[PDB]
Amino acid sequence: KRPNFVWLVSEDNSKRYLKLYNAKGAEMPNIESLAKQGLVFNNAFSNSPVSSTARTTLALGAYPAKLAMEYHRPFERINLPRELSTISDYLTKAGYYTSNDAKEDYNFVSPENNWSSSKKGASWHNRKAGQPFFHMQTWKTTHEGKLHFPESDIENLSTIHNPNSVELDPIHPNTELFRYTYARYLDLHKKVDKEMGVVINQLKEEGLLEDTFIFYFGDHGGVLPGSKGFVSERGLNVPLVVRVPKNFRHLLHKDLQAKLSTRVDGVISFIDFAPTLLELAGLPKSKLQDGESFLSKNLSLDDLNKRNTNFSFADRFDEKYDMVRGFRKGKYKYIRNYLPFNPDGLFSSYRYKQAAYREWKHLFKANKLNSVQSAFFKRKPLEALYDLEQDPFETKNLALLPQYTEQVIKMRAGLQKKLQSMPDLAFYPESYLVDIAKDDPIIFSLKHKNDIARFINIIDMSLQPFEQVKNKLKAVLLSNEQWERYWAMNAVLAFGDKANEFLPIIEKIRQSDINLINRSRAIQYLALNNGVSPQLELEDLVKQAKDPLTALAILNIATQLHDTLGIAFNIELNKLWSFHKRTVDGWFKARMDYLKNI
Template sequence: MKNIYSKIFCLSVGTLVPLSALMAQQAPNILLIVSEDNGCDLGCYGNSHVYTPNIDKLSQQGMKFMSAYVTYSVSSPSRGSIFTGLYPHQNGQIGLATHKYSMYEGIKTLPKYMRELGYVSGCIGKIHVNPESEVPFDYWENKDANFGKKNLKSYADKAVEFGKRYSGKPFFLMVNFPDAHFPLQRQVDGLPNRLVDEKQVAALPYINVDSPRHLSFVASYYDCMNRLDESVGMLLAEMQSHGMLHNTVIIYMSDHGEQFPRAKCSNYEAGLHIPFVVDWPGHIAPATVNTALMSTVDLLPTFIEMAGGTVPEQLPGKSLLPLFSGEKDKIHSYIFAGGMGSAPIMHYPRRSVRDDRYKLIVNYNYSEDNPHYNLYLQQQGHFAGGLSEEELHLAPDSMKHVFNTWKRPPLYELYDLWNDPYEFHNLSDKKEYQAILCKLKNVLLQWQEETNDPISKPELLKAINEEVKSILNKDVDYMQPGFRWRYLDYFLNDTIQ
């Protein structure tokens, strides 16, 4: 594994083309707006329970992607892919930063690329990867997670402060809003102005259990979406009033799906599928709907190319610019996602691949229960939106089978997303689908080989499983100061010391 990493870590300034190629056309500013823990529950994506006019307007003015996906349905690994253009197993951030998972030191990240191309970079809101020093934004404010959703107007104020401090240079600005991360608040500081009627909402379709408690959480989640949209509106209004949106590409996305059963922390569609909207006047036709498969590993190549640079060949993603212009209607035949569980108590290694129609999920620890099931069952903390045993008992038998599959999945799960968009019917053991299963298994194995996926090697999978068990058995106190995961050595060196 050393070769690919050394190339990624040590890419020189010479691999990037300077701004001279864009002198005739000024390099655009890039505004990346990222929300937390939500799927495509926006008006522009067809959800009539929410009120999201600001994000809907971006969609009307630009391009809405219908098949956008993250690389891992948890915050830190997902953000690690945005920052590095690499899959989590390539950059090292295979779990939550709060649980000491980390990127490899010396890795090249988005602010470093943008600086070489003459940009200033800023971040408002959490970064949430380790080590933070490897993501050296020129400006970083509102650093805490702000799960209380307080003082959201300050995000707009800080954006203006950034613009004033670095006026005259093209900028990259990432604004991370805390909605809709748990705990869900219906209203904070008078926001949102428009509340959702709890009596009008229905169960989330991939859960399909109409319990009053679940419906209450759904309404609160939708209120978070309304408040998110108002936050986006404040941000854009302030930036517009200070002249910051001239020649600016505006991108809105979520970091992964919502915190409900079979969503966040899973490789199901509700965890990996995200909203992705791009408004770029003069470059993207208004009200365009794009159905091409795209992944968040495509973001860094896109930003580099927007800024006038040449995309390093070692990055696995592809620039989205040909999709923006209509030059191409497709850049990927397959997209991929990882997953390790995000924390020791949730450890459950898995990988997935999907094409335009079918998805394959591989569960490497399939002989054990999926720990996420029991965490959601306990309905505590960030998992408060789970379903109790009583609620599951009242569910239709068909849904009981779905939840049992999630609890103790087989090695392979295969879904026909055209006919089964919520992944209720596993087809992996059906004779008529064996050719499709075999094809996707081979595609996944090829991707794992190309990206040096450590858990495709039995000895490395065994090593990370044992390292996690030593933590769960309290042989190691991983929250003590100075703790460092050993996988950062044996994954990188491809050997067990």
């Protein structure tokens, strides 16, 4: 009476590596067979560009940013609010047998009985007769770590796919190493298709195909350089195929029954997956969920194709931090860089274990990249706007062109409205946010919704003419609210030399602010714009830092200064402070090792 669900998930991979989507992608017979009686989605996206935040999104059908869960990997996992749970929990409570093999990577504390079984080898096979099932399985074959091979492999190990015929992303240098790396990733797609075929063939042999909705997708965009970790479309777009079972076509509009392979162009987001399973299972959506089912009885293909919106979020990835938000609407992609002085290339240990990332940066410093290839390593515009139909690789910023003036304002207002209404908790620094919000993020968000609107208004003053906002900005710099001073300094950093008139106030923040991150921002400004040598002060503030996250924040600032000004830092940490402890220790070790050398 009720449908089964299967989620087949490959790690870290975007759609361009699949022949299903790209003429130069990898042949994948097993996935392509799913597509024969399936919906092939051309515009599926995660809402963030890394595993933990995307998988959190998949599970909850809600934005991690509004739940203090936007940090990979978490310093502290957050407890779920009363009225929101995971799709595996909802289904388990509805009588489904739910199995997960095996990666979770949630940024919340798990519900009790979250899965019937979640471990290596967990399977639908242990369900009682007549009991519907939900099986989720992850393959790590396409994970970023698999591209961390030694550069000598270009000579010593050959690929099955031809690197000489690789057509690279325009932001990439056209090098032997980049073509080779691309080819290596194509090879992994061939391998993971084989592996997924094992599970698909079991379902076939057991006569379950026509009772089961089978989803195949990647768990976020990636994973060549400039993708994973960024809310460019590269970090967000994923393949998505849904094989529609014959016995439950009646749950779907005739348009979507996939009697023949059917392409869908409407924008689907990871927030939509859980509500989709809920509707197919005949269960109600939670009021705290942000997504909307894309498989519904009265929803035509035309109607589904009208959907054209995706909001995306990036904050901390391992030791490296930045704050970026993306807003896609129709053909337009808008990016808001709240901290534009942080280049996307800002050092991250794990990113740069990929030899292509190191070559990319080396070529940048050797002045051998063109302007499209070098944008990754440079100071960012406060806003960028792209026409994805004309410019799918986001190479031409339209925000400074006169005919796009109205569109800039429309996208700007849309994002502001969304982030205010959510509200986006990440306008509170993690070092403050997560410890307070840990027991119930919703309670925190209700109390601080207005405060967050104020933070957003303050930082968005940096979009305006300096003289127009000068007085307002000054009052906030002198505010009694430490996080308002924080966002005011960030706006000042955005303005750069245009805010020189504030030098005395910045100096006082530098010397005397009760908040050490505020001091660090002031120091950062004076180092970037006024020749101040920040090494000693920042080293001192790191040692003085009350807790790990505050220290980590200051180390991120030291990294930005390191990269931009070519200076080394001799870092020593606070005396005052186990897979979690290993992870956290690794962040600091990564930062200390890196900063020691110019």
